[PDB]
RNA sequence: GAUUAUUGGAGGUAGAGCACUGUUUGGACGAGGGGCCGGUUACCGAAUUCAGACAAACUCCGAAUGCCAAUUAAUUUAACU
RNA sequence: UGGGGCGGUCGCCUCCUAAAAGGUAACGGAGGCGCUCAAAGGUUCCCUCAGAAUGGUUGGAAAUCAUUCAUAGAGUGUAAA
RNA sequence: UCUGGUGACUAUAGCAAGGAGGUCACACCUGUUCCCAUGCCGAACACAGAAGUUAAGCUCCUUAGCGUCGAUGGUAGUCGAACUUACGUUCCGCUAGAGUAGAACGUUGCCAGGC
């Protein structure tokens, strides 16, 4: 037997996802990465290959002991506030290789609640 | 009664092998209990019966494997459910095994019991069963056809001899 | 963990007179004649066998 | 006698525009079965696998991976 | 009596005969061989003849390899008949030899016995030939 | 172990390659460490004499221009139909 | 395998022709199809 | 309309030559029917390690052809409608 | 229609002949079609290779079961590409 | 400004082998109460944790070992020309495939922490 690691499988699934998913500086990508203890969010124009905003669950602006889910709610709220200054329009949500469920759904709903038009 | 194994990690293996850390100890993962054909021309009732038999053997509902091809040399096609299994993982695995090896050679009537080696070289058993030491909750009081099982222990072990050292934990070597 | 289809197994006392390995389970729920508390305080129905006295190897 | 005088009418497959030439907004770039060439930028794939332009510009055949090809159409004018 | 066991296609185009030989231009198995200097088709009754002639002179002495195999069928019309109502039935099997190619090799025998064996074989073949040894240098 | 060589100048055509092979010369390259690639020509009978005495896998001190190179035969192209060497490669072994 | 005609109960038109075979679908089939008289999707049913 | 240089593609062109393969051949190796007592061996079949053939019904390349672009030069006042 | 007859043929699809594109003949070389599918269509999604050994109650030695290498060699309703 | 997220390039970027490592990371790990879940099974997916752990994944450093790349030279072939239609020859352009020497244990963009 051998235990398959989770992140390479995630990367395969993410590659299959990102084939009709790109950031074009008016719908920019909202990439999500969750490891095991945090979550991270980037906002990228894929056409230039340039990220624009960033938020994380280990950033000291949002770091407490809630759930990993209300944490994710804060990460979504933070990235919505950070991108709220400019280009806060319709974006495209890239969930990585992850289910739209649990932590990722929480951060997506939090980002959607607070101005982002996806 | 799992904690006996939680002694066996160093009762033999950190003794006889002396690994660098307790993470690299061999460890048994899954139990697969592949039932048999019971060729369901009329034995669909016997299929249901043997499935219920394996239910009484193990508290998980079995999965009914169908035939993988439409071969000759047998009347079979795609579909045609011709096997059952249960994957045992945890407390069901330990609770099954600790109960099983207590009664197993007691109803096997054998000195050596299985073989010193039936192994593949990766710490996998390929074990055969004549089906008597099982059904100790509902006996032969209602079943007609005897059965037999194919049970393989798969481990995190990498070789057959470390499977023997894990088979020093109430085994038939 | 799918409720309903699984057979009711439960930790009934498999306590032999030979070392009393009462950590097994199943549906052999007889009348709870012995409820040993450090063992399973349940049906005792596996109360005696040749389990840990005379194995055909380990007699 | 024999039994061998059948054929099919040849379909005129292959490239229909060149690399470097200007095309208008909907014209057929490549006819093929399957995807010998994949579609790239501004190039769509028909239901018979016809590769067509979606804007007007210059057609570029380029490579895709180690071993695949694609056509893109760039808007520059 | 050399012929393949099965072919994918019973009627094949006929081989081109121009050029020099693609491969097999060296003695690799025995001590001596017979090299071809012109081009022909070789028809596997010629192979059987040249092998029988070469064998019985060696009196079951050394060993002989055949570096040529007939893969290609050839057809002909049986009686002389009107032109073209399809291809005819398969008649025999040919290999195609071009200059450079070793046809036979022998080992386990003296040099002059090998020269005499390969000369006797070469009178059966439809191609010009030359006795050769192992290359070195 | 003492072949002599002459540097071929640039762009031998197909005609003078076979004209040069009509004499007793054979075209050759020298490459390896110590040198760049040098296109030389070599007399054939002398090369056969050196090979006969030094072995197929031997060492040759052959002179290019000014200098001499210790060198071994890397490969060679042979024409089996008329038995002449037609190209030879020299690997500088130092 | 036969041709079937879908009929709208309120459109008053038989505009949608399809196919089915009989041993797989002995019953009369029905779908929700757009009829442009009423400008909406309605139940069309095999006659 | 054209006709004739450099640069770019397309075909994976063929001629050649073998990039897995698919097929066909003469290499040399221990296990399985088996020779026998369920094996001892031979021969076979299949499996792994030299040299050939088709690649008309093939894979790794690419003379000449063709398509085209030049804010690019000699030719035909003819072009295409 | 390599005189005519007898035999064999009218259409469509796919290879090969067919010689960088495309096109290309023969009573030249090989094969299919004259439908099927209420899911074998759409769609978010989800979820995602055999064989080979290996060694096992069955064991056709392989049906199902288990480990590891295995190219889409598997698989793809239907012939080939 | 080392990692780590995330893009771009034909594996020169991969497999194999050998050696090191760890709370700003990163994984194994512990469990099923809850969202959710296995055509059986918390294996996976999901969630709640954080006792253990560098063993494996992962990172970093050594190897050319298998793959990958790969000239120069010289040959097959071939456009054009001239002999002649020889299983050809000659002149001139274009120069293969293979194989040799040799490369290669990746460069580069953006971001945030660590700094």
Contacts of D4 in chain E (CB under 8 A): 86
Q: Give the pairing of strands F25-32 and F38-43.
A: antiparallel
Both tokens of residue B13? 């293996």
Integer Cα distance of B56 and B142 in angstroms: 13
Please name the member of E100, E135, E136 whose beta carbon is closest to the beta carbon of F81.
E100
Q: Are A36 and A70 in contact (CB under 8 A)?
A: no
Of B139, B39, B152, B146, whose CA–CA distance to B86 is shortest?
A: B152
Nearest to C57 among B56, B61, B172 (CB): B172
Look at residue E55 and tell me if it is in a domain. Answer: yes
Alpha carbons E2 and E93: distance in angstroms, whole number: 8
Instruction: Name the residue closest to the C1' of I65 by its CA.
Output: B34
DSSP assignment of chain A equals --PPPHHHHHHHHHHHHTTS----SSS-EEEEEE-SS-EEEEEEETTTTEEEEEEESSSTTS--SS-SSHHHHHHHHHHHHHGGGS--S--EEE-TTS-SSHHHHHHHHHHHHTT---
Q: Is residue E80 part of a domain?
A: yes
Contact E98, E40 (CB under 8 A): no
Note the CA–C1' distance, E128 to H18, in angstroms: 29
Specified resolution (Å): 2.4
Q: Are B113 and C56 in contact (CB under 8 A)?
A: yes
Chains with 3+ CB–CB pairs under 8 A to G are: none
CATH number for the domain harbouring residue F11: 2.40.240.10
- Angle of the E111-122 helix axis to the E46-58 helix axis, nearest 10: 150
* Cβ–Cβ gap B137/C55 under 8 Å: no
Sheet holding A29-34, edge to edge: A50-56, A39-45, A29-34, A92-94
Pair E30, E122: CB distance under 8 Å:
no
Chain B residue numbers with beta carbons less than 8 Å from the beta carbon of A1 are 29-30, 122, 154-156
F9 φ/ψ sector (left φ>0, alpha ψ -120 to 50, else beta) = beta
Kindly tell me the burial class for residue D29, based on how many C-beta atoms sit within 10 Å of its own C-beta (0-12, 13-18, 19 or more).
Answer: buried
Phi, psi of G42 (to 5 degrees): -140, 170
Contact (Cβ atoms closer than 8 angstroms) between residue E43 and residue E70: yes
> What CATH number is associated with residue E65?
3.90.1170.10
What's the total number of domains in chain F? 1
Cβ count within 10 A of residue A51: 15
* Domain span holding position E78: 23-137
Task: Say which experimental method was used.
Answer: cryo-EM
Q: State yes or no: chains E and D have 3 or more CB pairs below 8 A.
A: yes
Token readout for E116 is 């005499």
Give strand H nucleotides closer than 7 A to any protein Cβ. 8-12, 15-18, 23-27, 50-58, 66-70
CA/C1' separation F3–I64 (Å):
75
**D15 to D26, D72, E34: CA distances (angstroms):** 15, 14, 52
B119/G11 Cα distance (integer angstroms): 73
Domain extent at residue F78: 4-92
Number of domains in chain G: 1
Query: How many Cβ contacts (< 8 angstroms) between chains E and F?
Result: 19
Residue A4 touches chain B, beta carbons under 8 Å: no
Structural domain of G39: 1-47
Cβ burial of B79 (10 Å; 0-12, 13-18, 19+) is: exposed
Say which of F48, F56, F80 has its CB closest to residue E26. F80
Return d(Cα G1, Cα B125) in angstroms, integer.
Answer: 55
Instruction: Provide the number of structural domains found in chain E.
Output: 1
Residue A115 falls in which region: left (phi positive, over 0), alpha (psi -120 to 50) or beta: left
What is the Cβ-side half-sphere exposure of residue B131, based on CA atoms within 13 angstroms? 19
Report the C-alpha gap between E61 and A53 in whole angstroms.
88
Closest CA to E76 of E64, E92, E65, E60: E92
Cα–Cα distance measured from residue E53 to residue E118, given in angstroms and rounded to the nearest whole number: 9
Q: In degrees rounded to 5, what are phi and psi of residue E123?
A: -75, -5
CATH code, G35: 2.20.28.120
- Sheet containing D43-45: which strands, arranged edge to edge? D14-15, D28-31, D51-53, D43-45
Nucleotide nearest to D63 (CA to C1'): J10
Q: Which residues contact E6 (CB under 8 A, 6 or more apart)?
A: none
């Amino acid at each position: 037997i051998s235990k398959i690691d989770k992140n390479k499988v995630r990367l395969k699934r993410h590659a299959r996802v990102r084939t009709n998913l790109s950031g074009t500086a008016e719908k920019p990508r909202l990439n999500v990465y969750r490891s095991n203890k945090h979550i991270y969010a980037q906002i990228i124009d894929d056409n230039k290959g340039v990220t624009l905003a960033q938020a994380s669950s280990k950033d000291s602006d949002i770091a407490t002991t809630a759930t990993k889910v209300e944490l994710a709610t804060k990460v979504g709220e933070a990235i919505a506030k950070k991108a709220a200054d400019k280009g806060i329009k319709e974006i495209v949500f890239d969930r990585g290789g992850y289910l739209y469920h649990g932590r990722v759904k929480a951060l997506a709903e939090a980002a959607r609640e607070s101005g982002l038009e996806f | 009664l799992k904690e006996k194994f939680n002694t066996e990690v160093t009762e033999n293996l950190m003794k006889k092998f002396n690994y660098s850390s307790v993470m690299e100890v061999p460890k048994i993962d899954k139990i697969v209990v592949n039932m048999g054909v019971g060729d369901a021309v009329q034995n669909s009732k016997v299929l249901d019966n043997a499935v219920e038999e394996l239910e009484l053997i193990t508290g998980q509902k079995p999965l009914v494997t169908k035939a993988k091809k439409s071969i000759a040399t047998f009347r079979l096609r795609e579909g045609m459910p011709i096997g059952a299994k249960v994957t045992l993982r945890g407390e069901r695995m330990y609770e099954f095994l600790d109960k099983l090896i207590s009664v197993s050679l007691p109803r096997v009537r054998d000195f050596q019991g299985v073989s010193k080696k039936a192994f593949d070289g990766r710490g996998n058993y390929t074990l055969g069963v004549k089906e008597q030491l099982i059904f100790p909750e509902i006996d032969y009081d209602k079943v007609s056809k005897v059965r037999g099982m194919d049970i393989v222990i798969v481990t995190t072990a990498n070789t057959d001899e470390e499977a023997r050292e894990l088979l020093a934990n109430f085994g038939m070597p | 963990m799918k409720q309903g289809i699984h057979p009711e197994y439960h930790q009934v006392i498999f306590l032999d007179t030979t070392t009393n390995f009462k950590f097994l389970s199943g549906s052999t729920k007889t009348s709870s004649e012995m409820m040993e508390w450090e063992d399973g305080k349940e049906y005792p129905v596996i109360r005696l066998d040749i389990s840990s006295d005379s194995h055909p190897f380990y007699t | 006698s024999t039994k061998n005088g059948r054929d099919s009418e040849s379909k005129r497959l292959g490239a229909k525009r060149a690399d470097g030439q200007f095309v208008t907004g909907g014209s057929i770039l490549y006819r093929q079965r399957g995807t010998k060439i994949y579609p790239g930028e501004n190039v769509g794939r028909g239901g018979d696998d016809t590769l067509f332009a979606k804007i007007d510009g210059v057609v570029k055949f380029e490579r895709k991976g180690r071993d695949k090809k694609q056509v893109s159409v760039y808007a520059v004018a | 009596m050399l012929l393949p066991k099965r072919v994918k296609y019973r009627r094949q185009h006929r081989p081109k005969t121009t050029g020099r030989s693609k491969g097999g231009n060296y003695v690799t198995f025995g001590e001596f061989g017979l090299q071809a200097t012109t081009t022909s088709w070789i028809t596997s009754r010629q192979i059987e003849s040249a092998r029988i002639a070469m064998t019985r002179y060696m009196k079951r002495g050394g060993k002989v390899w055949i570096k040529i195999f007939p893969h290609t069928p050839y057809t002909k019309k049986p009686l002389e008949v009107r032109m073209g109502a399809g291809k005819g039935a398969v008649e025999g099997w040919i290999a195609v030899v071009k200059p450079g190619r070793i046809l036979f090799e022998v080992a386990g025998v003296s040099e002059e016995v090998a020269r005499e064996a390969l000369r006797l074989a070469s009178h059966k073949l439809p191609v010009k030939t030359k006795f050769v040894k192992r290359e070195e240098l | 172990a003492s072949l002599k060589s002459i540097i071929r100048q640039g762009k031998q055509t197909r005609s003078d390659l076979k004209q040069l092979r009509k004499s007793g010369k054979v075209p050759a390259v020298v490459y390896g460490y110590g040198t760049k690639n040098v296109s030389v020509k070599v007399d054939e009978v002398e090369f056969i004499k050196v090979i006969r005495e030094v072995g197929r896998n031997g060492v040759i001190e052959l002179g290019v221009g000014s200098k001499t190179i210790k060198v071994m035969v890397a490969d060679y192209q042979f024409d089996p139909l008329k038995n002449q060497i037609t190209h030879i490669d020299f690997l500088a072994i130092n | 395998r036969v041709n079937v005609t879908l009929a709208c109960t309120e459109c008053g038109d038989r505009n949608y022709i399809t196919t089915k075979n009989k041993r797989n679908n002995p019953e009369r089939i029905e779908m929700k199809k757009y009829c442009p008289r009423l400008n909406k999707y309605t139940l069309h049913r095999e006659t």
